[PDB]
């Protein structure tokens, strides 16, 4: 017989068999994973801030020196992340057994416990047994990398879209539908260095107004190279200083040009090799609820970009993307789910979209594709989306953001320094670049993971799948015809979920809605039926009080989260007992707020445990109200509630006001809104004839991309000459430009484009 326990024994993780650079390199070489020749880095040295950033000397009110990579001694960078829990320290992230015990306690207090309620105990227990929250292992990270490499080079090797018949403009016209963008506006054009994005207007004595045009960074996240072991918040001056120098040196290189006989070529190679570290990310082990069985085989990675690289790319994308709340709910025929929020009537409107007789139809968010076809709901994920990205995918994304974000009626709102960086440098820094793990510098296959940095690129990849789907008359996702798309584009995907008779099942939610907080305004004794699309993590259920469909956190996601709570991070001097009890209040109430309210045992157990923590803090005189002021920052589900200004209370009233329909935000697009849909654009695009909707800025970027890096100034001149000669069909316009670049002898040779040249220079010390 086998011993069985109510409360699982503390799990001791297996030993990491790759916790050594000798073992790691052996494993990578055995799998044919590329290990780069190590590049060195000048040691960090203190320099007076007023000498490096004199334009920010007015910041005397509320670092006298900056630590800069300028020292005469070179070092090889090292990054050894800590994996928690481990065999040595297994108690890092314990399961919430107090919640489990409370659920069991409550289920026993019920006369003749109903299998229905018992299933909540069974589901939580199974999650505790099979899962573990933590950072995985080096072995897991390495196995994941080989899997990332398999997606890029293995079964279905990556393909650059431009080689398949796509162009920068044809992709841009597809993204006009799937990702509509507005201007940076509510702004300054891309013509200035980061330190000049902080503007003082008025007299600096009696409180002057300060204009902040810099994108917002996570101050607690890793700084990246060249500052391992430091946060972004303690390297702010440094990341601006390095960005300043990089852009100033780049401007100089473009000012000097190619030189006689191309004599300035070595100056470009010298600079790019000097700034190699901008193309090398720290391989951060992602903390997640992993399966225990795959602790050594699967650890997700976060490609921690260097701070200057992140800052410079963000200066292009963030001002546009933060000012583009454009989606399915405010633009007709738009498949985008960008900025979608399920609350305030959001989910009700998507369900009504699904229930509409029209089909086939698609929905898109990053690597996520949602399709309804033949009355069936399909949730499609790109198989490790980031690993499918080529450098040409990203420069096409950069082309899109610049031509419709950074353009004033066709005219470029960016200079050639910024055009060069976006088209010919930035794709090379973060795609098919490398990473640092231990003391080893190894290749990155595709783009490195990180939801923030990868969004536009993944969305583009999904947009191409949707285009290819349209071209073959929108076949059913589970057919061989739909599967052939991955071979066509070199982009791996899979169906994670499908629900047959989707409309019928959504309609039955209205009929079979059970009494609860949003139907009768009472504490539920039975869970109300929920329909499981996993629409960005959300299920649908029907509220009788509001008369619409409410959002319910995916059941499996909800119980995984309940099983293994996340840590706080460090806490220098927190009450250490009050702060802990306060974090439990956040944990349990936020768990109810996202969907726990729908599940009777979970709801009541979270309510009780949070209540016991509240009463303990009330008696001890803890500032709980002040602690819960910005609770969204303290919760794993905070992103869904950001900007609502709501308290952490889960009542009939609070759930009603959270879900009460509020009219969708007006669309913000930097051009006439296209309402025709993606099918119309796909069919018009396959004929080969389409116009230049980018105008002058499109030709400038074409010339920049098609010509040598140091000839970027001449490139713009040739594009300006073509634009003035017109006094449109792309195609003939791009052929004429390509002829002008050939006549000026500035056009790069095939297989030796500016993008490929910068990549080689970054890994050639």
XYZ file of C-alpha atoms in Angstrom:
765
model
C 0.000 0.000 0.000
C 0.927 3.688 -0.359
C 0.828 6.423 2.302
C -1.694 9.173 1.542
C -1.970 12.501 3.380
C -4.577 15.269 3.646
C -1.948 18.019 3.720
C 0.948 17.325 1.291
C 4.473 16.961 2.678
C 6.875 19.838 1.959
C 8.342 19.107 -1.473
C 12.124 19.067 -1.777
C 13.064 20.106 -5.351
C 15.516 17.926 -7.319
C 19.178 18.933 -7.593
C 20.116 21.132 -10.540
C 22.439 19.020 -12.749
C 23.518 22.098 -14.777
C 24.541 24.486 -11.979
C 28.069 24.810 -13.417
C 29.408 26.624 -16.533
C 31.404 23.509 -17.503
C 28.227 21.396 -17.485
C 26.140 24.138 -19.150
C 28.570 24.668 -22.057
C 28.753 20.878 -22.534
C 24.952 20.642 -22.758
C 24.678 23.561 -25.211
C 27.440 22.267 -27.511
C 25.892 18.758 -27.466
C 22.604 20.258 -28.696
C 24.311 22.409 -31.356
C 23.386 25.576 -29.469
C 25.706 28.449 -30.434
C 28.179 29.630 -27.788
C 29.689 32.997 -28.763
C 33.335 33.999 -28.446
C 33.341 36.001 -25.179
C 33.488 39.788 -25.508
C 34.941 41.869 -22.681
C 33.716 45.077 -21.079
C 35.587 48.082 -19.653
C 35.296 48.276 -15.852
C 32.789 50.694 -14.325
C 34.391 53.892 -13.024
C 33.062 56.940 -11.160
C 32.699 60.211 -13.089
C 31.227 63.589 -12.108
C 27.558 63.745 -13.186
C 27.851 67.472 -13.995
C 30.542 66.620 -16.580
C 28.513 63.901 -18.350
C 25.017 65.386 -17.985
C 25.465 69.176 -17.605
C 22.010 69.878 -19.092
C 20.442 68.205 -16.033
C 22.329 70.289 -13.440
C 19.087 72.121 -12.560
C 17.968 68.912 -10.800
C 19.551 70.087 -7.520
C 16.177 69.968 -5.732
C 15.527 66.442 -4.375
C 23.920 61.181 -7.770
C 26.989 63.475 -7.619
C 28.906 60.792 -9.565
C 27.948 58.276 -12.270
C 29.450 54.800 -12.698
C 30.460 54.521 -16.365
C 31.976 51.636 -18.411
C 35.106 53.640 -19.272
C 37.904 52.082 -17.151
C 41.205 50.945 -18.679
C 40.806 47.383 -17.347
C 38.515 44.944 -19.182
C 36.350 42.242 -17.590
C 34.101 39.436 -18.832
C 30.523 39.874 -17.511
C 28.976 37.283 -15.173
C 25.346 36.591 -14.237
C 24.434 33.890 -11.701
C 20.706 34.046 -10.869
C 19.364 32.478 -7.666
C 16.856 29.654 -8.117
C 14.157 29.383 -5.439
C 13.100 26.997 -4.113
C 15.986 24.507 -4.287
C 17.005 21.207 -2.675
C 19.045 23.261 -0.183
C 16.272 25.810 0.524
C 12.876 24.174 -0.204
C 10.704 26.526 1.896
C 10.931 29.615 -0.354
C 7.347 29.614 -1.680
C 5.057 27.360 0.381
C 1.566 26.362 -0.828
C -1.429 28.068 0.800
C -2.375 25.181 3.099
C -4.198 27.602 5.436
C -6.628 28.259 2.558
C -6.905 24.513 1.881
C -7.628 23.761 5.558
C -10.240 26.539 5.695
C -11.994 25.164 2.584
C -11.992 21.672 4.114
C -13.282 23.153 7.393
C -16.142 24.955 5.597
C -17.018 21.906 3.488
C -17.380 19.858 6.673
C -19.689 22.404 8.303
C -22.144 21.801 5.461
C -24.811 19.134 6.022
C -24.264 16.293 3.545
C -21.466 17.982 1.597
C -22.294 18.251 -2.106
C -19.775 16.709 -4.504
C -20.031 20.106 -6.180
C -18.425 21.938 -3.268
C -15.968 19.093 -2.643
C -14.541 19.549 -6.158
C -13.124 22.925 -5.043
C -11.117 21.135 -2.334
C -10.075 18.435 -4.836
C -9.018 21.028 -7.426
C -6.972 23.083 -4.939
C -5.283 19.948 -3.542
C -4.365 18.715 -7.037
C -2.799 22.119 -7.800
C -0.799 22.025 -4.556
C 0.442 18.483 -5.340
C 1.420 18.943 -9.003
C 2.602 22.574 -9.073
C 5.441 24.564 -7.524
C 5.947 28.331 -7.589
C 9.553 29.394 -8.180
C 12.483 30.212 -10.474
C 13.032 26.649 -11.761
C 16.606 25.571 -12.566
C 19.557 26.209 -14.907
C 18.697 22.802 -16.400
C 15.152 24.058 -17.035
C 16.408 27.342 -18.516
C 18.826 25.533 -20.854
C 16.218 22.989 -22.010
C 13.868 25.899 -22.730
C 16.604 27.585 -24.816
C 17.061 24.447 -26.930
C 13.262 24.417 -27.378
C 13.386 28.123 -28.345
C 16.116 27.140 -30.840
C 13.978 24.253 -32.165
C 11.141 26.678 -33.005
C 13.603 28.994 -34.804
C 15.761 26.505 -36.745
C 14.257 23.012 -36.364
C 10.957 21.526 -37.561
C 9.674 24.758 -39.119
C 12.623 27.202 -39.462
C 11.932 30.951 -39.319
C 11.325 32.895 -42.528
C 11.791 36.621 -43.082
C 8.473 37.996 -44.452
C 10.129 40.185 -47.119
C 11.437 37.021 -48.804
C 7.911 35.530 -48.953
C 6.317 38.336 -50.986
C 5.583 40.766 -48.150
C 6.941 44.318 -48.106
C 7.291 46.931 -45.344
C 4.187 48.681 -46.728
C 2.018 45.584 -47.330
C 2.622 44.506 -43.709
C 1.936 48.100 -42.577
C -1.441 48.104 -44.369
C -2.329 44.862 -42.553
C -1.321 46.444 -39.233
C -3.536 49.428 -40.125
C -6.411 47.054 -39.315
C -5.019 44.757 -36.607
C -3.120 47.440 -34.659
C -4.396 50.983 -35.373
C -2.079 53.652 -33.947
C -2.338 57.352 -33.106
C 0.286 60.107 -32.758
C 2.647 60.420 -29.742
C 0.848 63.702 -28.875
C -0.913 63.811 -25.509
C 4.903 65.555 -27.807
C 8.423 66.035 -29.196
C 9.673 64.354 -32.417
C 12.429 61.705 -32.497
C 15.276 64.196 -33.024
C 16.712 64.574 -29.504
C 18.897 62.705 -26.995
C 17.264 61.194 -23.821
C 18.708 63.908 -21.527
C 16.945 66.541 -23.650
C 13.600 64.768 -23.108
C 13.550 66.435 -19.675
C 12.657 70.083 -20.339
C 12.661 72.976 -17.857
C 10.359 75.842 -18.868
C 10.370 79.094 -16.886
C 12.539 80.406 -14.048
C 14.435 77.825 -11.972
C 13.991 79.511 -8.575
C 10.315 79.880 -7.614
C 9.242 76.385 -8.740
C 9.607 75.807 -12.497
C 7.450 73.501 -14.634
C 9.263 70.321 -15.708
C 8.224 68.464 -18.873
C 8.910 64.714 -18.841
C 8.959 63.064 -22.281
C 10.897 59.946 -21.242
C 9.054 56.592 -21.157
C 8.312 55.083 -17.750
C 10.603 52.262 -16.649
C 10.237 49.632 -13.940
C 12.741 50.930 -11.364
C 12.902 47.588 -9.516
C 13.742 45.467 -12.587
C 17.290 44.469 -13.597
C 19.459 47.203 -15.114
C 21.034 44.689 -17.507
C 24.518 45.121 -18.964
C 26.813 46.829 -18.138
C 25.368 46.847 -14.587
C 24.804 43.281 -13.355
C 23.443 43.179 -9.793
C 21.924 46.652 -10.107
C 18.357 47.860 -10.639
C 17.207 50.375 -13.271
C 16.317 52.780 -10.438
C 19.938 52.959 -9.282
C 21.294 53.347 -12.848
C 18.932 56.051 -14.234
C 21.670 58.639 -14.854
C 23.898 55.909 -16.303
C 21.328 54.600 -18.830
C 20.684 58.148 -20.073
C 24.430 58.874 -20.296
C 25.116 55.717 -22.344
C 22.087 56.377 -24.589
C 23.368 59.940 -25.128
C 26.828 58.730 -26.183
C 25.478 55.952 -28.420
C 23.171 58.367 -30.282
C 25.805 61.128 -30.473
C 28.396 58.727 -31.916
C 25.757 57.432 -34.357
C 24.881 60.990 -35.448
C 28.601 61.644 -35.998
C 28.989 58.480 -38.115
C 26.077 59.579 -40.322
C 27.434 63.147 -40.510
C 30.853 61.959 -41.733
C 29.226 59.450 -44.096
C 30.832 56.492 -45.868
C 34.052 58.369 -46.687
C 36.252 58.209 -49.788
C 36.530 54.543 -50.879
C 34.414 53.761 -47.789
C 37.295 54.735 -45.484
C 34.957 55.399 -42.530
C 33.706 51.770 -42.469
C 36.092 50.760 -39.662
C 34.770 53.611 -37.480
C 31.298 52.032 -37.625
C 32.687 48.549 -36.866
C 34.710 49.969 -33.961
C 31.660 51.683 -32.442
C 29.289 48.702 -32.813
C 31.819 46.274 -31.293
C 32.323 48.759 -28.427
C 28.566 48.754 -27.791
C 28.227 44.954 -28.105
C 26.721 44.769 -24.611
C 23.615 46.603 -25.849
C 22.788 43.423 -27.802
C 23.259 41.039 -24.853
C 20.474 40.340 -22.350
C 20.613 38.686 -18.934
C 18.847 35.321 -18.982
C 16.516 35.885 -16.021
C 14.708 32.783 -14.695
C 10.982 33.580 -14.710
C 9.186 32.829 -11.441
C 5.991 30.890 -12.215
C 3.723 28.091 -11.020
C 5.536 25.257 -12.787
C 4.681 21.563 -12.933
C 6.910 19.657 -10.481
C 7.580 16.962 -13.096
C 9.158 19.544 -15.432
C 11.216 21.444 -12.816
C 14.419 20.410 -14.610
C 13.070 20.473 -18.190
C 11.031 23.684 -18.356
C 11.949 27.082 -16.935
C 10.734 30.154 -18.822
C 13.318 32.880 -19.423
C 13.162 36.661 -19.406
C 15.625 38.365 -21.759
C 16.657 41.287 -19.548
C 17.556 43.990 -22.077
C 20.299 46.498 -21.248
C 18.749 49.712 -19.873
C 19.944 51.991 -22.722
C 18.654 49.508 -25.341
C 15.292 49.307 -23.567
C 15.141 53.113 -23.158
C 15.931 53.849 -26.828
C 13.452 51.303 -28.236
C 10.785 52.493 -25.753
C 11.266 56.121 -26.879
C 9.994 54.967 -30.292
C 7.221 52.531 -29.310
C 5.788 53.728 -25.965
C 4.657 57.283 -26.900
C 2.696 55.785 -29.818
C 1.418 52.587 -28.131
C 0.351 54.309 -24.890
C -1.679 56.765 -26.995
C -3.444 54.085 -29.076
C -6.504 52.692 -27.243
C -7.810 51.194 -30.489
C -9.600 47.837 -30.548
C -12.630 45.711 -31.497
C -14.836 47.715 -29.093
C -14.326 51.172 -30.666
C -13.324 50.530 -34.306
C -15.532 48.502 -36.658
C -13.906 45.468 -38.300
C -10.870 45.810 -36.022
C -9.728 42.421 -34.654
C -7.425 43.972 -32.022
C -7.800 43.279 -28.302
C -5.103 45.816 -27.377
C -6.003 47.741 -24.192
C -9.005 45.439 -23.674
C -10.395 45.457 -20.150
C -13.153 42.932 -19.235
C -14.703 45.175 -16.562
C -17.010 48.192 -17.072
C -19.083 46.166 -19.569
C -16.026 45.122 -21.601
C -16.557 41.345 -21.614
C -20.308 41.705 -22.291
C -19.453 43.486 -25.555
C -17.037 40.750 -26.725
C -19.657 38.069 -25.959
C -22.209 40.016 -28.038
C -19.530 40.141 -30.760
C -19.232 36.323 -30.601
C -23.030 35.806 -30.529
C -23.497 37.866 -33.717
C -24.301 35.579 -36.714
C -21.195 36.695 -38.661
C -18.499 34.005 -39.124
C -15.657 33.238 -39.664
C -14.172 36.079 -37.586
C -10.894 36.689 -35.751
C -9.570 38.457 -32.657
C -5.891 39.218 -31.963
C -3.609 40.125 -29.031
C 0.153 39.631 -29.395
C 0.690 35.917 -30.016
C -2.942 35.135 -29.174
C -5.472 34.515 -31.938
C -9.149 33.920 -31.182
C -11.326 32.612 -34.008
C -14.978 31.656 -34.230
C -15.673 29.361 -37.190
C -18.627 26.979 -37.715
C -20.106 28.053 -34.340
C -16.908 26.975 -32.549
C -14.588 29.113 -30.409
C -10.866 28.603 -31.042
C -8.081 29.887 -28.800
C -4.806 29.797 -30.742
C -1.331 30.487 -29.353
C 1.868 30.956 -31.312
C 4.201 28.171 -30.156
C 6.775 30.204 -28.204
C 5.927 33.309 -30.253
C 9.163 35.242 -29.667
C 11.294 32.400 -31.077
C 9.529 32.789 -34.462
C 10.671 36.410 -34.821
C 13.284 37.350 -37.416
C 15.099 40.706 -37.532
C 13.060 41.578 -40.650
C 9.826 41.072 -38.666
C 10.925 43.709 -36.143
C 12.185 46.269 -38.678
C 8.777 45.936 -40.383
C 7.210 46.675 -36.977
C 9.559 49.665 -36.634
C 8.550 50.792 -40.136
C 4.885 50.684 -39.076
C 5.339 52.646 -35.818
C 7.388 55.334 -37.597
C 5.191 55.707 -40.712
C 1.850 56.027 -38.882
C 2.940 56.962 -35.351
C 5.916 59.260 -35.991
C 4.593 61.037 -39.085
C 2.757 64.314 -39.604
C 0.644 63.791 -42.750
C 3.332 61.717 -44.506
C 6.230 63.881 -43.314
C 8.760 62.156 -40.994
C 8.696 63.219 -37.334
C 12.107 61.575 -36.901
C 15.663 62.263 -38.098
C 18.087 59.873 -39.837
C 19.848 58.983 -36.563
C 16.557 57.627 -35.223
C 15.550 56.100 -38.573
C 18.925 54.304 -38.671
C 18.565 53.046 -35.093
C 14.997 51.769 -35.599
C 15.512 50.137 -39.012
C 19.150 49.042 -39.003
C 20.288 48.729 -35.358
C 17.448 47.962 -32.896
C 16.282 44.747 -34.641
C 19.891 43.498 -34.467
C 20.214 44.313 -30.750
C 17.211 42.296 -29.522
C 16.540 39.717 -32.282
C 19.006 36.941 -33.125
C 21.391 38.646 -30.700
C 22.708 36.906 -27.585
C 22.335 36.475 -23.828
C 24.422 36.128 -20.676
C 23.916 33.124 -18.404
C 26.606 32.312 -15.846
C 29.878 33.527 -17.352
C 28.789 32.341 -20.805
C 27.695 34.506 -23.729
C 25.411 32.439 -25.949
C 23.124 33.023 -28.938
C 19.508 34.127 -28.640
C 17.326 32.431 -31.261
C 14.579 34.814 -32.367
C 13.589 37.572 -29.952
C 14.077 37.010 -26.217
C 10.993 36.588 -24.015
C 9.406 39.486 -22.118
C 5.747 40.415 -22.693
C 6.394 44.180 -22.744
C 9.221 44.210 -25.321
C 7.750 41.474 -27.539
C 4.148 42.715 -27.938
C 4.300 44.496 -31.323
C 6.526 41.825 -32.900
C 4.218 39.004 -31.731
C 1.135 40.940 -32.872
C 2.761 41.313 -36.312
C 3.414 37.547 -36.432
C -0.257 36.859 -35.632
C -1.328 39.483 -38.194
C 0.579 37.558 -40.895
C -1.148 34.317 -39.831
C -4.512 36.118 -40.094
C -3.582 37.473 -43.537
C -2.580 33.994 -44.742
C -5.822 32.663 -43.214
C -7.797 35.155 -45.337
C -5.896 34.222 -48.528
C -7.061 30.591 -48.438
C -10.729 31.469 -47.755
C -10.620 31.257 -43.933
C -10.429 27.473 -43.281
C -11.347 25.922 -39.921
C -8.441 26.207 -37.390
C -8.287 22.419 -36.810
C -7.944 21.543 -40.523
C -4.826 20.657 -42.543
C -5.372 23.844 -44.582
C -5.049 26.067 -41.494
C -2.009 24.064 -40.336
C -0.241 24.716 -43.675
C 0.053 28.411 -42.688
C 2.982 27.636 -40.360
C 5.018 26.200 -43.263
C 4.104 29.233 -45.407
C 5.353 31.786 -42.861
C 7.786 29.787 -40.698
C 5.666 30.628 -37.646
C 4.745 27.808 -35.246
C 1.276 27.748 -33.647
C -1.158 25.458 -31.813
C -4.785 25.280 -30.684
C -4.781 25.519 -26.889
C -8.568 25.419 -26.550
C -11.759 24.885 -28.558
C -15.429 25.104 -27.530
C -18.150 23.652 -29.782
C -21.632 25.230 -30.016
C -20.209 28.464 -28.576
C -23.310 30.631 -29.133
C -25.673 28.060 -27.587
C -23.450 27.700 -24.511
C -23.220 31.485 -24.058
C -27.015 31.787 -24.396
C -27.564 29.079 -21.744
C -25.534 31.113 -19.217
C -28.472 33.548 -19.081
C -30.955 30.736 -18.416
C -28.894 28.746 -15.904
C -27.369 31.621 -13.893
C -27.238 30.707 -10.193
C -27.926 33.116 -7.305
C -24.844 34.998 -6.079
C -23.284 38.448 -5.634
C -24.307 39.468 -9.159
C -27.637 37.589 -9.199
C -29.763 38.335 -6.129
C -26.904 40.032 -4.268
C -26.283 37.116 -1.897
C -23.404 34.888 -0.776
C -23.307 31.983 -3.282
C -23.993 28.413 -2.128
C -23.432 27.051 -5.642
C -21.138 28.236 -8.442
C -22.805 29.889 -11.434
C -22.025 28.325 -14.856
C -19.181 29.910 -16.693
C -18.053 29.648 -20.212
C -14.447 29.156 -20.930
C -12.858 31.047 -23.687
C -9.781 32.092 -21.846
C -10.167 35.504 -23.466
C -6.874 36.917 -22.186
C -7.445 34.809 -19.063
C -11.167 35.510 -18.689
C -14.325 33.382 -18.661
C -17.917 34.542 -19.182
C -20.894 34.238 -16.826
C -24.267 36.022 -16.700
C -25.300 38.597 -14.099
C -29.033 38.896 -13.399
C -28.554 42.053 -11.303
C -26.846 43.892 -14.181
C -28.450 41.969 -17.065
C -25.169 41.427 -18.895
C -22.212 39.044 -19.127
C -19.564 39.340 -16.413
C -15.883 38.364 -16.577
C -14.649 35.393 -14.536
C -10.967 34.542 -14.096
C -10.278 31.238 -15.858
C -11.032 28.462 -13.333
C -7.723 26.603 -13.768
C -5.741 29.884 -13.571
C -7.684 30.950 -10.462
C -7.018 27.713 -8.547
C -3.337 27.568 -9.581
C -2.926 31.083 -8.187
C -4.823 30.135 -5.013
C -2.583 27.083 -4.514
C 0.742 28.950 -4.697
C 0.855 32.613 -3.607
C 3.711 34.789 -4.882
C 6.317 36.320 -2.559
C 6.796 39.969 -1.735
C 10.451 40.648 -2.550
C 12.540 41.894 0.375
C 11.178 44.278 3.007
C 13.778 46.200 5.013
C 11.990 46.576 8.353
C 8.324 45.916 7.539
C 6.410 45.071 10.716
C 7.452 41.569 9.659
C 4.149 40.410 11.149
C 1.773 43.276 10.399
C 2.999 43.630 6.825
C 2.570 39.874 6.421
C -1.006 39.909 7.716
C -1.635 42.889 5.430
C -0.383 41.046 2.326
C -2.789 38.183 3.129
C -5.702 40.652 3.009
C -4.514 41.693 -0.474
C -4.001 38.052 -1.509
C -7.391 36.708 -0.425
C -9.588 39.678 -1.425
C -7.975 40.132 -4.871
C -8.475 36.390 -5.418
C -12.193 36.864 -4.703
C -12.378 40.009 -6.849
C -10.996 38.380 -10.039
C -13.352 35.390 -9.923
C -13.196 33.709 -6.513
C -16.587 35.325 -5.817
C -18.162 32.770 -8.172
C -16.885 29.722 -6.256
C -18.650 29.176 -2.872
C -15.929 27.387 -0.869
C -13.037 29.440 -2.268
C -15.019 32.681 -1.832
C -15.938 32.003 1.809
C -12.469 30.676 2.730
C -10.727 33.732 1.258
C -13.303 35.951 3.001
C -12.723 34.260 6.383
C -8.905 34.196 6.149
C -8.820 37.849 5.026
C -11.262 38.734 7.822
C -9.079 37.072 10.462
C -6.076 39.017 9.154
C -8.112 42.262 9.141
C -9.303 41.782 12.747
C -5.740 41.028 13.887
C -4.453 44.240 12.264
C -7.363 46.333 13.586
C -6.599 45.295 17.182
C -2.876 46.042 16.744
C -3.526 49.484 15.207
C -2.059 48.909 11.744
C -2.447 51.565 8.997
C -4.382 49.152 6.756
C -6.254 51.847 4.788
C -2.963 53.601 3.929
C -1.400 50.245 2.980
C -4.343 49.412 0.683
C -4.284 52.861 -0.989
C -2.423 51.514 -4.040
C -3.178 47.790 -3.650
C -2.996 47.102 -7.411
C 0.798 47.462 -7.204
C 0.835 44.862 -4.394
C -1.290 42.278 -6.252
C -0.549 39.829 -9.095
C -3.932 40.778 -10.611
C -3.342 44.546 -10.284
C -2.998 45.292 -14.023
C -6.715 44.573 -14.551
C -7.731 47.154 -11.916
C -5.196 49.923 -12.648
C -6.726 53.405 -12.882
C -10.142 52.424 -11.495
C -9.450 53.748 -7.967
C -11.471 51.004 -6.244
C -11.159 49.594 -2.710
C -10.331 45.966 -1.873
C -13.852 44.953 -0.866
C -15.788 42.112 -2.489
C -19.514 42.728 -2.037
C -22.658 42.679 -4.184
C -22.308 46.465 -4.563
C -18.559 46.530 -5.330
C -18.835 43.812 -7.996
C -21.788 45.651 -9.560
C -19.972 49.008 -9.819
C -16.895 47.221 -11.207
C -18.996 45.715 -14.007
C -21.477 48.554 -14.672
C -21.250 49.356 -18.423
C -19.234 52.470 -19.266
C -19.114 53.657 -22.916
C -15.878 52.593 -24.686
C -13.099 55.175 -25.092
C -13.023 57.028 -28.445
C -10.451 55.762 -30.983
C -7.174 57.646 -31.425
C -5.729 57.094 -34.908
C -3.166 59.289 -36.700
C -5.055 58.854 -40.008
C -8.592 58.230 -41.368
C -9.978 55.133 -39.619
C -10.279 52.023 -41.799
C -13.528 50.152 -41.097
C -13.430 47.749 -44.074
C -11.837 44.860 -42.148
C -8.817 42.609 -42.730
C -10.308 40.470 -45.546
C -10.648 43.489 -47.854
C -7.030 44.516 -47.212
C -5.802 40.924 -47.723
C -7.573 40.532 -51.092
C -6.459 43.953 -52.381
C -2.884 43.149 -51.356
C -2.514 39.821 -53.197
C -3.019 41.462 -56.619
C 0.365 43.156 -56.123
C -1.095 46.626 -56.651
C -1.451 48.897 -53.615
C -0.551 52.528 -52.911
C 2.025 54.082 -50.577
C -0.048 55.001 -47.518
C 3.182 55.949 -45.715
C 4.012 58.874 -48.033
C 7.479 60.431 -47.770
C 8.379 58.782 -44.436
C 7.813 55.371 -46.042
C 10.268 56.092 -48.868
C 12.813 57.535 -46.415
C 12.682 54.295 -44.383
C 12.834 52.157 -47.544
C 15.969 54.011 -48.676
C 17.462 53.778 -45.163
C 16.855 50.003 -45.046
C 17.991 49.293 -48.636
C 21.216 51.336 -48.447
C 24.427 51.165 -46.381
C 24.210 52.439 -42.792
C 26.722 55.302 -43.163
C 24.866 56.513 -46.286
C 21.625 57.246 -44.375
C 21.773 61.001 -45.100
C 22.111 60.407 -48.865
C 19.312 57.826 -48.520
C 16.835 60.449 -47.261
C 17.927 62.835 -50.047
C 17.131 60.245 -52.751
C 13.703 59.603 -51.188
C 12.949 63.346 -50.986
C 13.879 63.730 -54.670
C 11.426 60.972 -55.664
C 8.632 62.453 -53.519
C 9.037 65.888 -55.152
C 9.194 64.400 -58.673
C 5.673 62.957 -58.286
C 4.197 66.501 -58.190
C 0.874 56.071 -56.465
C 1.304 52.265 -56.382
C 4.367 51.479 -54.184
C 5.814 48.768 -56.427
C 6.807 51.122 -59.245
C 7.705 53.693 -56.584
C 10.028 51.282 -54.725
C 11.604 50.049 -57.985
C 12.375 53.660 -58.962
C 13.892 54.341 -55.517
C 15.980 51.150 -55.691
C 17.270 52.359 -59.073
C 18.179 55.780 -57.616
C 20.123 54.162 -54.751
C 21.997 52.049 -57.315
C 22.867 55.132 -59.404
C 24.152 56.937 -56.297
C 26.057 53.719 -55.424
C 24.754 53.714 -51.837
C 22.603 50.571 -52.112
C 24.006 47.630 -50.141
C 24.593 44.224 -51.754
C 22.051 41.401 -51.322
C 22.760 39.245 -48.226
C 24.874 42.143 -46.901
C 22.162 44.624 -45.858
C 22.760 47.275 -43.173
C 20.888 45.102 -40.635
C 23.035 42.006 -41.310
C 26.216 44.126 -41.181
C 25.460 45.554 -37.712
C 24.673 42.052 -36.368
C 28.100 40.764 -37.438
C 29.825 43.796 -35.885
C 28.100 43.194 -32.529
C 29.554 39.670 -32.242
C 32.999 40.324 -33.757
C 35.369 41.589 -31.055
